[PDB]
């Protein structure tokens with residue numbers, strides 16, 4: 001029946017050659033022996049991997065956009081990039097060349113996006129992790145198995161699958177092996193150590209995902225096309241949780257929407273107070289935790305149906321991780337709110353100032369708060385410019401030249417650095433010297449120079465998110481960050497009175 | 513087998529090596545580990561081109577037309593390559609130098625290498641020494657370890673099948 005296992009299948013010549021040769025050599029050897037079964041399994045491997053079997057590619061872009069939009073809420077930029085890639089492939093006739101690569105924070109959708117791409121192109125999906133072995137062993141009874149790519153071919157029974165090289169930056173020589181594999185001039189002749197026969201891999205589609213692009217091979221990055229999968233703001237995370245995460249968790253726990261319900265407000269609370277990373281890896285474990293507690297509560301008999309609510313969520317997940325996010329609600333004359341940029345989101349922080357000695361020989365500035373060198377220098381520059389600005393504005397003030405000030409950025413255990421918060425420190429010093437509080441729900445961020453120019457900053461997205469989350473109504477940015485601010489979703493910047501300044505005098509007019 | 517070496521000009525010491533390894537291969541028996549390690553050793557030794565050079569066109573004007581058409585500017589590199597061609601002409605033999613281009617990112621240091629190898633009609637190999645920390649990625653492992661590969665220059669000589677292939681070492 002071995003001839004029937006490849007009868008209807010189109011076979012090349014030099015493959016049927018080895019097939020008939022092994023059939024004749026198997027008729028030579030004795031059945032049921034330590035020589036027969038080996039060659040039997042080898043001849044099985046020759047007659048198992050397809051040769052002429054394909055999958056009709058999905059060339060249409062509308063159907064591709066539909067199948068990409070069904071799953072994976074959000075991701076509009078990655079979706080646009082995938083659609084453009086399919087367009088270039090359709091227009092080029094083939095799909096070889098560069099090899100796509102998705103990189104970003106963990107648990108962000110880089111494997112499921114490759115699965116959805118495979119479903120888009122009607123290619124058969126297959127993933128093998130590279131976190132030698134991709135070439136198979138030799139038939140000296142040591143390794144009686146082919147490589148994982150040959151097993152991909154056998155499994156998907158299609159000559160043009162979509163193989164996913166997941167976590168390519170966790171690879172151990174496999175580096176040069178992959179470098180040769182992805183090459184389209186060595187692609188047609190991939191000789192594996194198990195099958196002496198070459199196999200054409202010039203129709204398979206390769207995708208690889210990683211988290212950091214600091215892996216060992218640089219000539220990969222010459223052939224790999226990098227695509228960046230960013231994080232998710234809280235709204236997108238809530239939508240993802242309501243549409244994909246909670247259903248799957250219910251399926252895994254055996255519950256259903258009637259028994260245990262997670263409303264929208266409790267999900268927003270869970271995201272806002274427990275899971276602030278760029279992915280959904282933590283929110284997934286949190287909803288699974290809730291559903292396990294609920295399963296126990298319904299099976300044990302404490303309640304025939306459980307309803308989670310923002311006044312008993314801590315009974316399910318424990319204590320909230322984050323907090324009120326506003327140390328001040330009304331700022332005294334000395335303090336001013338600045339914005340910080342972590343790697344796990346934004347943050348709001350205040351800058352406090354006070355007299356250190358009674359009377360309001362020059363003055364001094366003492367600086368605390370675990371500040372880096374760049375931040376201490378920013379404080380020095382802000383001190384100088386604040387003295388100059390007060391001299392030119394109120395030449396009869398005598399403050400800031402005779403007073404001894406202490407400047408503290410609260411949460412003194414946290415090390416903090418950066419050239420931003422220069423305008424914040426200038427505003428704090430000025431508002432203390434004039435005895436006037438700044439506008440109440442006013443945040444600012446910007447690097448000041450010695451003459452007052454406001455220089456651009458980084459992380460405008462995270463800072464603006466953290467400002468909107470803290471009840472900021474007016475935010476002040478450098479004018480060279482107008483682009484960065486306007487490349488934000490309309491719901492992030494919807495209710496903020498924004499001001500773009502180039503010199504500090506405009507900040508002074510806004511804050512006072 | 514021994515037919516992969518009749519086109520090659522094999523030195524004498526490597527001839528003794530391949531002879532003694534053939535003796536070991538013949539005395540050993542199939543389906544055994546030593547059989548396989550000697551088979552790999554002999555395959556690698558018989559895959560190295562032991563006497564062959566690539567036909568290098570030392571024609572000046574054709575190589576200048578090749579260089580001047582696929583890369584703008586970069587007068588120093590092209591002048592050095594032309595002087596290299598002139599010296600190869602005078603010496604009558606195919607020679608080899610060691611060059612290094614340094615400059616800001618993305619000014620043609622990598623593509624000029626490929627166009628140069630096309631001009632001289634040599635082969636072309638590139639591999640980066642950027643993140644490597646162990647020397648076995650160049651000098652190769654030893655034939656005794658459980659997984660043995662001969663490095664990354666023997667691979668050049670084997671795949672290019674030449675002895676003057678213009679290896680480019682990036683970064």
Ligand SMILES: *[B]([O])([O])[C]([C][C]([C])[C])[N]C(=O)[C]([C]C1=[C][C]=[C][C]=[C]1)[N]C(=O)C1=[C]N=[C][C]=N1
Nearest residue numbers: 338339340341342347416417418419420421457
């Ligand atoms: B700014 O954008 O440079 C800013 C100044 C901040 C003290 C108001 N720096 C930061 O926010 C840093 C990140 C950074 C940016 C640019 C250069 C160097 C560092 N973040 C923090 O200091 C910080 C503070 N608290 C919590 C977490 N991170």
Ligand SMILES: Nc1ncnc2c1ncn2[C@@H]1O[C@H](COP(=O)(O)OP(=O)(O)O)[C@@H](O)[C@H]1O
Nearest residue numbers: 072073074106107108109110111112240244280
């Ligand atoms: N935009 C999204 N829409 C729907 N589900 C998502 C989205 N982003 C992430 N997920 C879910 O979160 C999980 C992400 O894990 P995964 O992306 O496989 O990890 P990694 O990014 O390390 O490969 C998946 O189960 C996926 O279903």
Ligand SMILES: Nc1ncnc2c1ncn2[C@@H]1O[C@H](COP(=O)(O)OP(=O)(O)O)[C@@H](O)[C@H]1O
Nearest residue numbers: 582583584585615616617618619620621622623
């Ligand atoms: N004169 C030139 N003509 C054509 N392409 C050029 C030229 N100068 C630079 N390039 C481009 O620069 C790129 C190569 O840059 P490279 O030398 O690899 O920089 P690095 O190696 O420092 O990253 C190629 O895409 C090439 O097209």
